[PDB]
Every structure is written in C-alpha cells, then in structure tokens.
Ligand SMILES: Oc1ccc([C@H]2Sc3cc(O)ccc3O[C@H]2c2ccc(OCCN3CCCCC3)cc2)cc1
C-alpha cells in the first residue's frame with residue numbers, strides 16, 4: 233500500500249465501502265413486539281461479514297498474516313461498526329440511523345437497561361462530525377486507520393515477523409496520513425488548517441475507542457459459544473476455490 | 476491560551492509539570508509484607524492532588540467553568556496518570572517506573588488478579604514512545620490534549636455557555652496542535668514527517684484511552700464513598716485566601 237498515490241488510496245478506499253443493510257423485522261407488524269437488542273444484534277452480526285470483505289480491500293491489510301488480520305479485527309470491529317453508524321446518522325440530528333428502516337432517537341434507547349448512555353455518546357459524535365462537515369473521503373480514511381491502529385500495540389510478544397508486521401502497518405498508516413493531508417490540501421485548506429483538521433479528526437478516534445470499550449462493557453452482560461477469534465478466523469481464512 | 480506563541484505554550488507547559496513522587500513503604504522492611512495495590516493506590520491518590528494543580532496551569536483550563544473543569548478531570552485522570560507512568564518508564568525497558576523506589580516488571584504484576592494484562596499494555600506503550608524517541612516537549616503537549624480532549628464530547632446537553640466552553644476548548648486544542656507542528660519543524664522534520672509524526676502521536680492517545688477504560692474496569696472490582704466528582708470539586712473549587 234506504499235506505492236499507491238494519495239489518489240489511488242482514496243479511490244481504493246471508496247471502492248471498498250460496504251453496503252447499507254436493512255433491519256429484519258416485518259414492517260407490517262407492530263413495534264412493541266420486537267426485541268430492540270435482538271434487532272440491533274442481528275443487524276450487527278450481518279454487517280460483520282461485510283466488514284471482513286471491506287478490510288481485505290484496504291491497501292496493505294492482506295499483506296499481513298492471517299493471525300494478525302484476525303487480531304486487528306477482533307480489536308476494532310465494534311469501533312468500525314460505530315464509526316459507520318455515526319457517519320450515516322450525521323444528517324439525522326437527534327437520531328441514530330442503525331438502518332434505513334431503523335431510525336432511533338434517545339428515548340428509544342431507554343428501552344434497554346444502560347443503553348441510552350451509549351446512544352448519547354454516539355449521537356454526540358454524530359453531532360461533532362456534522363459540525364466539522366466531515367467528508368466521505370475523510371471518513372473512509374478514518375475507518376481504515378481504526379482497523380490498522382486499534383490492535384497494533386497489543387500484538388503479544390514480538391518475533392522478527394511480528395516486527396515487520398508492525399513496521400508495515402505503521403507505513404500504511406503514514407500513507408493514509410499523507411492521503412488525509414492531500415485531501416485537505418486539494419480542498420483549499422491552508423497548511424495550518426490542515427494539521428489542525430488532521431488532529432481534530434484523529435482526536436475523534438479517541439472518543440470512538442471510548443464508546444466501543446463502554447459498548448463492550450454493556451454487551452458483556454446481555455443476550456446478544458465460539459470465540460470471536462475463531463469465528464473471525466473462519467471468515468478470513470478462506471480458500472480461493474471460488475475464483 | 477490563544478495569544479500565546481507556540482513557544483509560550485511549551486514553556487508554560489514545561490513549567491507546570493508536576494513533581495515525581497515516591498512510594499510509601501519502609502524500604503527497611505521486606506517486600507512480601509506490602510500490598511502492591513495498596514502501594515499503587517496510595518501513590519495514585521497523592522498524584523491526584525498534584526494533577527489538579529498542573530491542570531490549572533494549562534493554558535485555557537481555568538477560563539472554563541468549575542463544573543467543566545471537574546468534568547474534564549473526572550474523565551481524564553486515569554489516562555493522565557498512565558501517560559505519565561509510560562513516559563517515566565520509557566528508559567526502563569521491561570519495567571514500569573511507578574516511582575523511583577518502585578520499579579516493577581511484568582511478573583511483579585501477576586501478583587494481583589488481572590493486572591499483568593494492564594501492565595502488558597502500559598509496557599508496550601512505553602516501548603512505542605521509546606522507539607519514536609518521544610521528546611519531553613511533545614509529551615507535555617500530549618498530556619494537555621488528553622486533559623482537554625477526553626471529556627469534551629460528553630458534556631451533558633448544550634446551553635449557550637456550554638457551546639462557548641466547547642468552542643474555547645477546541646481553540647486551545649488547535650493551538651497545542653500548532654505547537655506540536657512548531658516543535659517538529661524546529662527539530663528539522665520535513666513537512667511530510669511533521670504531519671506523519673503528529674498523527675502517530677495522536678493515534679497513541681487512542682491506546683491510552685483504551686488502557687484507562689480497561690483500567691477502570693479492573694479497578695471497579697477491588698479495594699482501591701464520596702463521588703470522585705465531589706472530591707474533584709472540593710480540590711478545584713478553592714478560595715484565594717492563601718494568596
Ligand atoms: O452496549 C452497546 C454497544 C453497541 C450497541 C449498538 S451499535 C450498532 C452499530 C451498528 O453498525 C449496527 C448495530 C448496532 O447496534 C448495537 C449493537 C448491538 C450488538 C452488537 O454485538 C453483539 C453480537 N455480535 C456482534 C458481532 C460479532 C459477534 C457478536 C453490536 C452492536 C448498543 C449497545
């Protein structure tokens with residue numbers, strides 16, 4: 233991923249974008265009958281498959297070992313889901329667009345114990361993105377930095393192959409950084425506004441980590457088996473027979 | 476804090492640095508007799524007082540309302556402790572320098588249930604800083620961004636005064652960003668290495684948030700009363716009689 237221009241990275245990234253999925257409940261039946269967490273859980277599960285495919289199309293991600301790819305995803309999947317939710321809810325003040333047929337507001341989160349607290353953080357993130365006028369080209373860069381950054385510091389020990397992995401990841405990170413600055417420059421930002429905006433975007437990533445951590449806390453004590461590792465492994469370790 | 480040059484900010488920041496404290500146990504008595512968590516808890520508590528004083532010397536922090544100052548600290552105090560620990564352990568590979576008389580390695584963390592996992596993250600952060608050759612001028616900027624950034628997105632609602640607060644904080648953030656770039660430029664980094672290094676530093680902040688969250692999780696289930704808010708309030712809401 234370190235020979236691709238800023239322009240090839242952005243195009244590679246927009247190309248790789250996953251689809252928008254729909255929630256699965258009969259829209260002919262009433263809403264008092266559906267488990268919101270079941271509806272949200274089931275939505276999240278189906279996105280995971282598409283996330284795995286997206287990640288293989290991120291420049292540099294497949295040059296990694298299968299084990300490392302599983303590690304990065306196992307660390308970042310909730311942050312990745314959450315930055316996607318915030319981005320599609322941007323133009324929907326006061327509401328989170330889980331799916332086009334599932335637009336939920338703050339009181340709708342009160343339905344499940346301790347959830348409105350997560351909602352409130354997600355909605356405020358969305359608010360910030362709106363206010364910053366985050367662009368679609370910038371968002372794809374952000375989402376890819378989260379995939380690459382979130383588990384780089386928790387690789388177990390550090391064998392020689394482990395060291396090259398980390399080196400490789402940091403070099404893809406630098407390239408996406410080059411790409412953000414490039415996108416900002418092309419949009420006519422002064423040098424100063426550039427570094428400033430880069431920093432405001434990257435600091436947002438610290439709030440998303442926060443919501444994910446909080447989110448895992450809340451999930452770990454609900455209904456929503458195989459380790460997530462093992463399931464990620466099966467999904468990523470695919471054959472090439474279907475070529 | 477938005478009329479201070481990059482140079483005044485750095486000097487203001489180095490000036491404000493808290494002291495290095497010592498652990499409190501008789502070094503004439505054996506180590507099998509001391510509660511490590513009690514030793515660590517007691518150390519952390521004493522640093523908190525000094526942290527509150529430091530924060531009042533960060534450019535722009537006291538222009539905030541008392542309530543907002545308490546909110547920022549209540550969100551960031553563990554991250555602030557942790558980035559300080561990582562920084563002083565930098566030149567102590569494989570070990571965390573909690574205090575000059577309390578240098579602990581990875582097996583020393585195994586002593587308390589679920590702690591070596593936190594140790595392992597802290598030590599890897601320290602490793603990264605070493606490898607990046609983080610400078611003391613850069614570290615102070617980072618520590619101040621954490622104070623200012625970590626709770627900006629969780630201010631409750633948003634009254635007019637709330638909006639000006641956020642505006643003010645974001646403007647101090649931009650200034651510290653200007654200061655990092657300035658520090659990097661002065662050190663002879665190319666424009667490119669600059670934005671790159673800014674990004675590598677800010678992405679580190681996402682790991683520190685992670686360790687803090689994990690850390691709160693682990694603390695919430697141990698020995699280590701008044702809300703932390705109330706206690707922060709008492710510490711910050713001081714009279715000026717002692718002038
Ligand atoms: O504490 C929290 C945390 C997260 C959430 C939200 S966020 C969210 C984001 C999406 O893109 C899709 C759905 C969605 O619903 C909740 C969501 C529900 C269940 C989730 O996961 C549980 C099941 N599963 C996920 C995929 C890997 C295997 C475990 C993930 C998100 C609400 C409360």
Ligand SMILES: Oc1ccc([C@H]2Sc3cc(O)ccc3O[C@H]2c2ccc(OCCN3CCCCC3)cc2)cc1
Nearest residue numbers: 515516518519520523556557560593690691693694699
């Ligand atoms: O799960 C974890 C989390 C953190 C820790 C570590 S980190 C750390 C960093 C320092 O600068 C000082 C001591 C220190 O010890 C532990 C530490 C122990 C207790 C702490 O706080 C408990 C008591 N107290 C802190 C101040 C506010 C009131 C509550 C904070 C850090 C170890 C395990």
